[PDB]
Amino acid sequence: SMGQMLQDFGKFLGMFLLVLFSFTIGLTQLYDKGDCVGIFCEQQSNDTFHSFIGTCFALFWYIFSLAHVAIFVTRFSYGEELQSFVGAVIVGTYNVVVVIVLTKLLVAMLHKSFQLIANHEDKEWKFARAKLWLSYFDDKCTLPPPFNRNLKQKRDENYQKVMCCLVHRYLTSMRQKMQSTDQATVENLNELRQDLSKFRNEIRDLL
């Protein structure tokens, strides 16, 4: 089920990558005018937003909402209040759009995908297990990784006999299902009324 539902993660990963790219462009454009450099430091300096790959790094650690990148990295080093406040508002908008919108959307799509998937999870598991078993059924690859006509006509006749038997059994079974499980319709009632009116007219003509 998880392997089946990873496609939802990919389809949503595209949208999140586009949103991340947009906010990375904005923060890099705003903050480019401004030892250990980046977010992988004891004191994460403002220089994390000074490059495109650094901005992608900084906005990547904002997804988990676990204070991996602190908010003082959005402060200019020389006291520009408007630019620092605008960068803080941009980072807050990014954090809202990711954490409080996109993550919950992903949870909702995973809800729908898992409710659809769990109906037939046994069948897919049995198919995958049969593939895994058929990978080991052959004798061409036996040792582990460290140490490494008349017959055709008889087979055709046997397969044709078995196929004819299966065809006969299937036909009788399915005609039993149409006779036993199909519900009546209004057409059946109309046909019954037609037969009754036929018998009434026959009685009228005879008597």
Binding site: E187, N190, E191, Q194, D195, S197, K198, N201, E202, D205
Partner: protein, 74 residues
């Protein structure tokens, strides 16, 4: 201000009473007046291909009723 409803497209033609009698006896299984109406059709008082309100002929009506004897007669 009241919309006056009218039949925009003509679909059913009544014509004579024999066509309506044939249509009514087709979906009631009235075999003997059906064969009388067919004898009059052989005389030539009516047309075999009659269109009802539903647009179904006598063959379609008796096929819907699933009746083989009157269909064979038709």
């Amino acid at each position: 201000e009241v919309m006056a409803l009218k039949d925009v497209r003509e679909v059913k033609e009544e014509n004579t009473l024999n066509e309506k009698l044939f249509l009514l006896a087709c979906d009631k299984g009235d075999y003997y007046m059906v064969k009388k109406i067919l004898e009059e059709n052989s005389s030539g008082d009516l047309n075999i291909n009659c269109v009802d309100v539903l647009g179904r002929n006598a063959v379609t009506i008796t096929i819907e009723n699933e009746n083989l004897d009157i269909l064979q007669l038709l």
